[PDB]
Amino acid sequence: GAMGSMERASLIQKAKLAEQAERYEDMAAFMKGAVEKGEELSCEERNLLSVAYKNVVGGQRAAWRVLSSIEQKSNEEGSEEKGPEVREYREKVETELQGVCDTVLGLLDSHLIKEAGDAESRVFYLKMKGDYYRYLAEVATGDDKKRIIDSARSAYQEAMDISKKEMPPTNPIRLGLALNFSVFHYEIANSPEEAISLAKTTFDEAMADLHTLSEDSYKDSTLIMQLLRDNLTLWT
Amino acid sequence: GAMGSMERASLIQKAKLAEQAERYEDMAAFMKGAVEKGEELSCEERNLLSVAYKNVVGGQRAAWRVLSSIEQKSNEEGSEEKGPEVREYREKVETELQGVCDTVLGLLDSHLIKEAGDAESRVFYLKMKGDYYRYLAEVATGDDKKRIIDSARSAYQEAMDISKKEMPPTNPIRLGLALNFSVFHYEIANSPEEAISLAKTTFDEAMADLHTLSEDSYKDSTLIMQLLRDNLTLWT
Amino acid sequence: RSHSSPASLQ
Amino acid sequence: RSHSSPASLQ
Ligand SMILES: *SCc1cc(N[C@@H](C)CN)c2cc(C(=N)N)sc2c1
Ligand SMILES: *SCc1cc(N[C@@H](C)CN)c2cc(C(=N)N)sc2c1
Ligand SMILES: C[C@@H](CN)Nc1cc(CS)cc2sc(C(=N)N)cc12
Ligand SMILES: C[C@@H](CN)Nc1cc(CS)cc2sc(C(=N)N)cc12
Structure with missing residues (x-):
């Protein structure tokens, strides 16, 4: 990799600088390089990795949704066909998104997950594996969609x-x-019934554990709880 | 160029799609490819070119300013020195910004400016030449700063x-x-006195010409006039 | 759309 | 900072 000659600490430092500069492609390349040094990631470094790639893939997902919508409407009844260009460009973005997912999944499989020696690190990486198979699933179609979905589930x-x-x-x-x-x-x-059941149980069990937290931890937990609540409002 | 095999019309279509998707790096590559077809650009196409590269270079300028500020403070009295990493990464962003300016300036010089057969097209391209020399000037230092500034002025x-x-x-x-x-x-x-004098004369002479405009043209003109006014408030 | 987790998690 | 022109101009 092009980051092979840079020190681990310098890569982490520069990932943090790139985050400040909102240069998420740089940030992801720096963190890839840091992972490839072969040492385990701290909690902070795991978050830097996740932030970098989540921003990169998030821009791709937003573009793919814009383009896919255009493409679906140019294929509606009475909607003229402007040629191959919308499909081509949607496919370009899709392929780039798939390459980012492949890269992350590759880091997790070589060798973040197997070396993760804590529940917190191993859960973080397995959640990320599920997330990036989910992003692949969002754009999957033929004969591999089902297997990508089940890789995310597993x-x-x-x-x-x-x-x-x-x-x-x-x-x-x-x-x-x-x-x-x-x-x-x-x-x-x-599986909307599974989704609802999981979000409800997750929220209620967390609510009953809040009393054990400091104010600092309480803030982190309740932010995610509100997202569970927001989804339950959409879904029910 | 990698856009050599794509039709001019397809490149323009895809530039517009990339703009909708907020994929400005793609948009700039598509418009570079369209320019390199060698045909003159319409008013709309000139604007697509400008939007693409202005967004690309704008992100670089914003990053460079973030990083340059960090770098200046790590060089203040009593501020520890965290090694070469801030300077290195600022230099990386600077070099990428310089490459974008070089690319645009190259399109203008080969051969947009010389073939521009209208006042409106020739002024648009000469303004862009000044703009991108200005962006180079913002990061220039040694022995070439003065010549870059005068290229922008000219x-x-x-x-x-x-x-x-x-x-x-x-x-x-x-x-x-x-x-x-x-x-x-x-x-x-x-040259703050020149700046103030120019902005005042520009605003006043435009104000006296508004009565000749349709509502559509009046809207375009007054948007820029308000920017002149906003600057005059900062500068005086 | 449904909301998913923010990128950083304590 | 000073304001410069928007990218698109009629
Ligand atoms: S693992 C300790 C840690 C915690 C955070 N904060 C999030 C849980 C809430 N903001 C964190 C944020 C980082 C970043 N985005 N630079 S790194 C890190 C580490
Ligand atoms: S040259 C005719 C033209 C005008 C505009 N509008 C700006 C002057 C104001 N919005 C224009 C915008 C374009 C875009 N960003 N896709 S292309 C174009 C052409
Ligand atoms: C069939 C499915 C998993 N069962 N595999 C994949 C499909 C696609 C779509 S082209 C991209 C990637 S990237 C990747 C990885 N583990 N690095 C696996 C896959
Ligand atoms: C000296 C100055 C103009 N007088 N030249 C340049 C300096 C730098 C900084 S490395 C980048 C570029 S890109 C470019 C072009 N016309 N394509 C000219 C320059």
Whole structure:
């Protein structure tokens, strides 16, 4: 990789600088380079990795949705056909999005997940594996869609099992995992009843654990709880 | 170029799609490819070119300012020195910004400016030449700063001469030219009195020409006039 | 759309 | 900072 000659600490420093500069493509390249140094990531460094790639793939997902909508309307009844250009460009963005997912999934599989020696690190990485298979699922169609969906499910489910055994119900990684698995169920797997049930149980069990938290931890937990509540309002 | 095999019309279509998707790097590559087809640009296409590169370079300028500020403070009295990383990364962004300016200036010089057969097209391109030399000037230092500044001045000045001979005082290209030349004078060339004088004359002469406009043209002209007014408030 | 988690998690 | 022109101009 082009980051092979840079020190680990310098890559982390520059990832933080790129975040300040809103240069998320740079930030992701720096964090990829830091991961490839082969050392385990701290909590802060894991978050830097996630922020970088989530911003990169988020821009791609937003573009793909814009383009896919245009494409669907140029294929409606009575809507003239302006040639191949919309499909071509949607495919270009799709392929770039798929390459980003492939890159992240590759970092997780070589070798973040296997070396993760804590519940908190292993759940974080397994949640990320589920997330990036979900992003692949959003654009998948033929004959591989079902297997991509089940790869996302398998990852989320293992993370869920560990988080329930090893973390308290208010743990922000546990909460964000459950949130994202509920979104998987609702938006990807056509399982709205599972999504609702998970979000309700997640919210109620966290509510009953808030009393154990400091103000600092209480703030982190309740932010994600409000997202669970917001989704339940949409879904019910 | 990698756009050599794509049709001109398809490149324009995709530039417009990329703008909708807020994919400005794509948009700039599509418009570069369209320019390199060798045909003259319409008013709409000139604006697509400008939007694409202005967004690309704008993100670079914003990052460079963030990083340059960090760098200046790590060089203040009593501020520890965290090593070469801030300077290195500022230099990386600077070099990428310089490459974008070089690319645009290259399109203008080969051969947009010489083939521009209208006052409106020739002023638009000469204003752009001044703008991108100004962006180079913002990051220039040693022994070439003065020549970059005078390249920006020479371009703006020729555009000003044509616009005053050939366009009415409310023409939005004339107005945006004068605005940007006044910013050059104030921020780059250390000529605040020239900047103020130009902005005042530009505003007053446009105000007296508004009565000749339709509502559509009046809207375009007054938007830029308000920017002239906003700057005069900062500067006086 | 449904809301998913923010990128950073304590 | 000073304001410069928007990118698109009629
Ligand atoms: S793992 C300790 C840690 C916590 C945060 N904060 C989020 C949980 C809430 N803001 C964190 C944010 C980082 C960033 N975006 N630079 S790094 C990091 C680490
Ligand atoms: S040259 C005719 C033309 C005018 C505009 N509008 C700006 C002057 C005001 N919005 C224009 C905008 C374009 C865009 N950003 N896609 S293209 C074009 C052409
Ligand atoms: C079939 C599915 C998983 N069952 N595999 C994938 C499909 C696509 C769409 S082209 C991209 C990637 S990237 C990647 C990885 N693990 N790095 C796996 C896949
Ligand atoms: C000296 C100055 C103009 N007098 N030249 C330039 C300096 C730098 C900074 S490395 C970048 C570029 S890009 C470019 C072009 N016309 N394409 C000219 C320049």
